[PDB]
Write a protein that binds this ligand. Structure first.
Ligand SMILES: *[C@@H]1O[C@H](CO)[C@@H](O[C@@H]2O[C@H](CO)[C@@H](O)[C@H](O)[C@H]2NC(C)=O)[C@H](O)[C@H]1NC(C)=O
Ligand SMILES: *[C@@H]1O[C@H](CO)[C@@H](O[C@@H]2O[C@H](CO)[C@@H](O)[C@H](O)[C@H]2NC(C)=O)[C@H](O)[C@H]1NC(C)=O
Ligand SMILES: *[C@@H]1O[C@H](CO)[C@@H](O[C@@H]2O[C@H](CO)[C@@H](O)[C@H](O)[C@H]2NC(C)=O)[C@H](O)[C@H]1NC(C)=O
Ligand SMILES: *[C@@H]1O[C@H](CO)[C@@H](O[C@@H]2O[C@H](CO)[C@@H](O)[C@H](O)[C@H]2NC(C)=O)[C@H](O)[C@H]1NC(C)=O
Ligand SMILES: *[C@@H]1O[C@H](CO)[C@@H](O[C@@H]2O[C@H](CO)[C@@H](O)[C@H](O)[C@H]2NC(C)=O)[C@H](O)[C@H]1NC(C)=O
Ligand SMILES: *[C@@H]1O[C@H](CO)[C@@H](O[C@@H]2O[C@H](CO)[C@@H](O)[C@H](O)[C@H]2NC(C)=O)[C@H](O)[C@H]1NC(C)=O
Ligand code: NAG
Ligand code: NAG
Ligand code: NAG
Ligand code: NAG
Ligand code: NAG
Ligand code: NAG
Ligand code: NAG
Ligand code: NAG
Ligand code: NAG
Ligand code: NAG
Ligand code: NAG
Ligand code: NAG
Ligand code: NAG
Lengths: 1017, 273, 50, 50, 31
């Protein structure tokens, strides 16, 4: 029997109290909704494997489940951990136990047969007594007792949780004792008592990342298994349990290799290392021998595991990797030196050996092997067969040899055949005696110089080759060069000395197979980003997954050029875009209900009824009010670089001074930003020299402004709409926020002055003094400014006022209903908060240091060793600030551009009237009204929009007495029997006379001229 | 960094949307092109192509010219969709003047539209009608020169090509940086791991990271600055579209040199003409 | 704090509160008040008073 | 930018010639890469700001 | 087949001789 692990197997990852925070951890947890094997026992228990840790749970009524057994063979050949809880005292033992064929404890208890012997036992612990169930008693289960058992680096960690009552629910498991048992555990058994039904559950852990949500009381109340399904992955990626509608990038799909491929040259001869290491005679260091090792199979584990060597230093390579790696050539430079001089045979050493007899490159790859000698290289009366160069006019270049018996003139005395003062021989010899000290006894040293691969390899380790599989993603190893990818046939032509090809990035593009000299292209196996297409979690938890730039064969299912989309049904009908996918495809949650994918609609299809003699002239109009929301400012943050990087630490601050001016230039940049935030606010709102006020009696021709003018009854003299706007938009690490210079009240006063000016004086307050004008006349000018004769307003003034008032009411209802109306300002707020939250979290990063807590380094390390860990933390906290500041400067530039635009609109939309199309809202602009909002400005743009139209016949000109008459303003229209001239944006036909039209030329040139009569008053 | 690049990709689609998608409906020209002698056959779609682009657009497209974790996302609006938006804008401009911008598209004869555009620059409308044939021929000739100019030399589209080159160049630099050692024994990460045990290896690997991260930060910073430049250009293009194509601009040299009459959008790779 | 937890942490991984090792009570740790200091001054060609 | 040349960045001396005249190449390599690691950042900061 | 043209030279054996070389001579045969 099996069941579904219903939200179980989560434990507290550590012993740190956290609250009201979501913490992400990767460790071995039981995944949510996994299948768990369910066993029941009436009145026996199998042996299970112990993979990487086991989740165990039980429901009890008679305490049948008593303990667990852990080990490898469980037969007295290895050590085995035994834990028993037999209702009274928990007993833990680690013995080389002999277990029975059927382990049990009797149930009043009358047996003890869990093991049969104790021998070479290493650990025992017994707890205090308690009382639990002991008798056979049936019923329903009341106590769910959950456990986690894992072994990490010899520490056997037991977690558990007891709860009254797989049941559905969530419960985190707290830690219990941490036992240093140090045993390799591969097997497991549970322990049941023999006389009563007592179920237990067994699960297994795999390496998973979990997101743990700690509540206000610090108890883990829920969790997301970040590797369960696309929705959980999305939630873990965003560090939140709620996901808004949209497309998120949560991970990356990567095809895994199926098998490994090991390819090496087919040589089986073994390398003559014994004739080098066990040689009869070593050369002297002035004339060291160099044997080339090639065309053989080498084995450096035999030389390495052998204990005969006194010193073993590898530069560039590690001794355990030498078995896999292989070389074009290996050279063994063999010579004897004095013991205290062993240190000089190393890269970047100087001395009488390093400069005169054996110089290594300072970029040396290989191994220095040395051992003491006292049987062969030393005698009584000393061994005088060993010569070294004692004087040379200049030092040695790497690996140069230079045999010379020329007597060395130390001075200017050209002796030229006789040794003397300042004329010595360069060759000197020290002797070796069995009675000499450690530093003066002989040592045999062989340095193995490795040429790492650049040409066909000939010296490879004992690793056996494998067969080669083409056209599949494999984990390959070609002559020690490793990587993963698909190997295909190629048509490239390496020339005979070339073995490898490279890409621009220096990665291998193709290789020549060492067994069959053919060229194989290496293309890494298909991969790409994975995006999760989801409606917001308040609607549905169903998601669709987009695998970017792949065909889905490699992975109902719909293939598009953005990738293969799985879980969304392809719908032939187009609609407006909701959640964009890419390449013209959008997805939405629609109708039971499911996610759909479709080709985006670009709008309704329409054709214009164009003809050479037909014009559409509007007969009615609508006054619309639209909302344009612009950022103006962002929070004026200020960061003390010293407290952030080096909080309350003199040692760190003194280290920070070695980085110079990085602090004051970051403080400078942020100060500059804060200043520009106040300048931006000042430029948008403070362009009016005086604070204007409305009269107490609001006689504005029927236009109701009570919802945009200040209401004196509030603690802050804001308009009703402004209050709505303010109700929609929502520090001890050296991080502060400066207040703005202009308080919200001051902004409200500026917008009030601008509104009162606009209402009572039109555009005149912008140019100079505020010149009072009736509001209806102001509108008359605004209508005239858009090509609509002013009488249209007066004749329809009441209607216009009602439409305005209704438009305003809709604005309040819209603003009062949904939160999304202010998204442009909220995103700015969110971005700034997000930048700071990222900045704060970066203090928790180690950056390679032993701890992210600066005080913990200082309290543990003395200053000098500590200096490395602290400069390493600074090297990262400074980068975090530079990244933050750079992003703030760029974001500030974006805000400045927006603020400049807002100021431009204020000047051209509110203070004047704009002829720029769609600059001050859609439609023919009349007026605009500023309203303040958090860190921004809201403009209410009042526009004239034609509403109803008729098809009229037209003509560009009318012939009368042979003369061509053209409109002064407007067009000629005909209702089918009579010609009239009328204004373009509003149907208002008038009789054609010589005072509405003008005469130019003669009716024989103009294309489309028609016959009529023009009445002459 | 993934966040910053996502933000950029999103702003690239918003920029495209703001420049081209300001029209609520997809307008179409009549099958009979009786526009008073003005020939638009070289800027209106030709149904015979696999992609309904204008002749000039094809000329523009013929002038402008991934396994290291580096990918390119497709745009949301395909070239065909952009062509449909520019077609709608052209058909609106031609058949309804500026009226489709303010509200509904109100049909008007093209010659009358030009009469208003001439009146808007201080030239009485009768001048057009008396000289209408000449004006149409000059327009048609001007268009022919545009094709001949565009059909001859590659340099006509340099502003868009430099953007393409800069982005390719940034990526090529980014890719080459993987070949740098940054003080490490080798630029190939797998070669370090296959040669050194983990603990000594940790130094060489953190050293390579310390450099690959800087390369990305440099790249991303440059992309954010370049993206800001593109955003400013896109905002300008949207402004021109609104004030040049949908209306008539009184702003001197904003919508070309001379007294502005009308403008026509044409799509181009990663830009507008 | 639950009985096995001794320390609390903030978002920055700094300690937010501790449990006193002698008397098992929870004490919040709030760093003592600090802030920037700004100097308001007329130019030094007028007065050196700030 | 000019003053940043006087910074040590963890090196024994801000003067590059003084490192070279005192240390042989191999031990010197650490002090010099350390100075570069800082002069490059100073330029990147300068260029970004520009 | 100095002639005009371009030709890159491929590597031949790499000999670990370890000698400080300051002088050179070519070798011609005598009839
Ligand atoms: C831990 O103990 C297990 C024994 O249970 C070891 O597994 C054996 O490994 C050898 C070598 O690969 C195999 O030949 C045996 O067949 C394995 N045993 C079983 C039962 O499969 C395991 O290697 C030990 N681990 C360590 C690190 O010592
Ligand atoms: C112009 O449109 C307005 C509404 O946009 C019309 O006013 C409406 O007229 C109807 C009469 O059929 C009334 O029932 C509505 O209550 C009116 N609404 C408002 C807000 O006044 C107006 O009549 C239209 N004018 C013309 C000439 O068609
Ligand atoms: C301007 O509009 C407001 C509503 O936004 C009017 O105030 C309402 O007036 C009616 C009386 O006709 C009351 O019953 C409502 O309760 C009022 N509402 C509020 C919120 O005050 C105001 O009277 C209008 N101005 C004029 C001059 O009529
Ligand atoms: C076009 O407009 C004219 C002017 O109003 C209309 O002529 C009027 O028609 C009504 C009834 O049809 C008569 O009572 C008026 O006396 C007419 N006016 C004049 C000056 O004679 C004409 O009918 C309209 N045509 C259409 C097709 O609507
Ligand atoms: C408008 O009226 C004029 C004069 O009544 C017409 O001009 C005549 O057109 C006919 C046919 O083209 C010619 O044969 C006459 O010689 C013209 N007379 C004059 C004095 O020009 C004109 O054709 C009429 N147009 C329309 C559209 O009816
Ligand atoms: C608009 O211009 C195009 C040319 O760009 C005209 O198409 C040409 O028409 C002539 C006939 O006069 C043909 O000989 C050419 O081969 C055509 N060229 C192409 C590319 O089609 C088109 O006829 C013009 N429109 C009108 C109404 O005259
Ligand atoms: C256990 O998992 C397998 C495969 O996921 C499933 O077929 C089986 O039904 C599961 N067990 C139960 C009892 O559902
Ligand atoms: C459980 O085992 C312990 C181990 O010493 C033993 O002392 C205890 O009496 C046992 N409980 C029984 C038999 O109920
Ligand atoms: C382990 O048990 C064996 C049993 O024969 C005994 O000889 C040995 O001394 C014990 N101890 C060790 C360390 O092996
Ligand atoms: C937990 O949270 C609740 C919220 O209702 C609160 O009343 C309670 O005091 C908190 N603490 C504990 C220990 O329950
Ligand atoms: C041995 O190497 C040769 C060289 O090409 C190859 O052809 C042959 O198949 C190899 N033998 C085996 C058993 O792999
Ligand atoms: C050198 O000789 C010893 C003893 O004969 C032997 O164990 C060792 O393996 C030899 N060296 C090599 C490289 O085989
Ligand atoms: C979730 O979103 C839906 C639709 O966007 C909304 O109606 C609902 O009120 C939201 N719920 C919460 C708790 O925010
Ligand atoms: C998708 O896979 C099919 C099957 O091999 C292939 O023919 C096709 O070219 C692939 N790519 C597409 C459809 O873009
Ligand atoms: C949608 O249209 C395609 C045309 O290629 C057709 O094959 C498909 O069956 C249609 N689907 C539905 C549900 O009508
Ligand atoms: C104008 O006429 C065309 C064709 O007769 C018709 O399709 C269109 O709807 C008409 N417009 C109005 C506003 O009646
Ligand atoms: C355009 O006007 C002319 C006369 O000016 C007329 O003959 C022609 O038929 C009109 N166009 C259409 C499509 O009717
Ligand atoms: C010793 O420790 C206990 C533990 O709480 C504490 O109550 C007592 O005051 C301590 N004594 C002194 C002298 O500090
Ligand atoms: C100092 O500033 C004052 C007022 O700003 C000015 O009158 C005076 O000349 C200045 N003096 C110097 C030396 O710049």
């Amino acid at each position: 029997a099996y069941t579904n692990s219903f939200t179980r197997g989560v434990y507290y990852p550590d012993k740190v109290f956290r609250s009201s925070v979501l913490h992400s951890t990767q460790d071995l947890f039981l995944p949510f909704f996994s299948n768990v094997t369910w066993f029941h026992a009436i009145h026996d228990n199998p042996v299970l494997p112990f993979n990487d840790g086991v989740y165990f749970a039980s429901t009890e009524k008679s305490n049948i489940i008593r303990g667990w057994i852990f080990g490898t063979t469980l037969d007295s050949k290895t050590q085995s951990l035994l834990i028993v809880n037999n209702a009274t005292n928990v007993v833990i033992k680690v013995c080389e136990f002999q277990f029975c064929n059927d382990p049990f404890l009797g149930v009043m208890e009358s047996e003890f047969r869990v093991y049969s012997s104790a021998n070479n036992c290493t650990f025992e612990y017994v707890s205090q007594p308690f009382l639990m169930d002991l008798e056979g008693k049936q019923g329903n289960f009341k106590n769910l007792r959950e456990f986690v058992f894992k072994n990490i680096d010899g520490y056997f960690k037991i977690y558990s949780k007891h709860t009254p009552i797989l049941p559905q629910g969530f419960s985190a498991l707290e830690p219990l004792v941490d036992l240093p048992i140090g045993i390799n555990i591969t097997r497991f058994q549970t322990l049941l008592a023999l006389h009563g039904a007592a179920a237990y559950y067994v699960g297994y852990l795999q390496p998973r990342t979990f997101l743990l949500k700690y509540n206000e009381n610090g108890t883990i109340t829920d969790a997301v298994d970040c590797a369960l399904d696309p929705l959980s992955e999305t939630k873990c990626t965003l560090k939140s349990f709620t996901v808004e509608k949209g497309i998120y990038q949560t991970s990356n799909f990567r095809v895994q290799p199926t098998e490994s491929i090991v390819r090496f040259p087919n040589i089986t001869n073994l390398c003559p290392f014994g004739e080098v290491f066990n040689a009869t005679r070593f050369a002297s260091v002035y004339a060291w021998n160099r044997k080339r090792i090639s065309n053989c199979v080498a084995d450096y584990s035999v030389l390495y595991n052998s204990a005969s060597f006194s010193t073993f230093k590898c530069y560039g390579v590690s001794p355990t990797k030498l078995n896999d790696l292989c070389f074009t050539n290996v050279y063994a430079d063999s010579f004897v030196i004095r013991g205290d001089e062993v240190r000089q045979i190393a890269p970047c050493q100087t001395g009488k050996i390093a400069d005169y007899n054996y110089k290594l490159p300072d970029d040396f790859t290989g191994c220095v092997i040395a051992w003491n000698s006292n049987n062969l290289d030393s005698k009584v009366g000393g061994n005088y067969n060993y010569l070294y160069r004692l004087f040379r006019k200049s030092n040695l270049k790497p690996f140069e040899r230079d045999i010379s018996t020329e007597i060395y003139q130390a001075g200017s005395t050209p002796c030229n055949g006789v040794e003397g003062f300042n004329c010595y021989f360069p060759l000197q010899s020290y002797g070796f005696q069995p009675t000499n000290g450690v530093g003066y006894q002989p040592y045999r040293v062989v340095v193995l110089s490795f040429e790492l691969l650049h040409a066909p390899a000939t010296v490879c380790g004992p690793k056996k080759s494998t067969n080669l599989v083409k056209n599949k993603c494999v984990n390959f190893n070609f002559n020690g060069l490793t990587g993963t990818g698909v190997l295909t046939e190629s048509n490239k032509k390496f020339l005979p000395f070339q073995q490898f090809g490279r890409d621009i990035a220096d990665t291998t593009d193709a290789v020549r197979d060492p067994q069959t000299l053919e060229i194989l292209d290496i293309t890494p196996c298909s991969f790409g980003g994975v995006s999760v297409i989801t409606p917001g979690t308040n609607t549905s938890n169903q998601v669709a997954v987009l695998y970017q730039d792949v065909n889905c064969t490699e992975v109902n299912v719909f293939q598009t050029r953005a990738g293969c989309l799985i879980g969304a049904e392809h719908v032939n009908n187009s609609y407006e875009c909701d959640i964009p996918i890419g390449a013209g495809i959008c997805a939405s949650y629609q109708t039971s209900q499911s996610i759909i994918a479709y080709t985006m609609s670009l709008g309704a299809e329409n054709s214009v009824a164009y003809s050479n003699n037909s014009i559409a002239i509007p007969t009615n109009f609508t006054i619309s009010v639209t909302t344009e929301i612009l950022p103006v400012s962002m929070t004026k943050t200020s960061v003390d670089c010293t407290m952030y990087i080096c909080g309350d630490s003199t040692e760190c601050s003194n280290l920070l001074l070695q980085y110079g001016s990085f602090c004051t230039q970051l403080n400078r940049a942020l100060t500059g930003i804060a200043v520009e935030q106040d300048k931006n606010t000042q430029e948008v709102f403070a362009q009016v020299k005086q604070i204007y006020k409305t009269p107490p009696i609001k006689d504005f021709g029927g236009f109701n402004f009570s919802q945009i003018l200040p209401d004196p009854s509030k603690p802050s003299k804001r308009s009703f709409i402004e209050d709505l706007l303010f109700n929609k938009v929502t520090k001890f690490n050296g991080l502060t926020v400066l207040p703005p210079l202009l308080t919200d009240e001051m902004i409200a006063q500026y917008t009030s002055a601008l509104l009162a000016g606009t209402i009572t004086s039109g555009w005149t307050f912008g140019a100079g003094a505020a010149l009072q004008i009736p509001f209806a006349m102001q509108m008359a000018y605004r209508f005239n400014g858009i090509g609509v004769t002013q009488n249209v307003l007066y004749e329809n003034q009441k209607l216009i006022a009602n439409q305005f008032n209704s438009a305003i009411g809709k604005i309040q209802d819209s603003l009062s209903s949904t939160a999304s109306a202010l998204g442009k300002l909220q995103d700015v707020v969110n971005q700034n908060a997000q930048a700071l939250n990222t900045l704060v979290k970066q203090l928790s990063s180690n950056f390679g240091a032993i701890s992210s807590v600066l005080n913990d380094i200082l309290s543990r390390l003395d200053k000098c060793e500590a200096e490395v860990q602290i400069d390493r933390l600074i090297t990262g906290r400074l980068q975090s600030l530079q990244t933050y500041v750079t992003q703030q400067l760029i974001r500030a530039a974006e805000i400045r551009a927006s603020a400049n635009l807002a100021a431009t609109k204020m000047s051209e939309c509110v203070l004047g009237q704009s002829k720029r199309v769609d600059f001050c809202g859609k439609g023919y602009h009349l007026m605009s009204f500023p309203q303040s909002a958090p860190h921004g400005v809201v403009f209410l743009h009042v526009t004239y929009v034609p509403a109803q139209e008729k098809n009229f016949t037209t003509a560009p000109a009318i012939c009368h007495d042979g003369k061509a008459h053209f409109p002064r303003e407007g067009v000629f229209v005909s209702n089918g029997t009579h010609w009239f001239v009328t204004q373009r944006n509003f149907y208002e036909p008038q009789i054609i006379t010589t005072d509405n039209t003008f005469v130019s030329g003669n009716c024989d040139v103009v294309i489309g001229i028609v016959n009529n009569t023009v009445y002459d008053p």
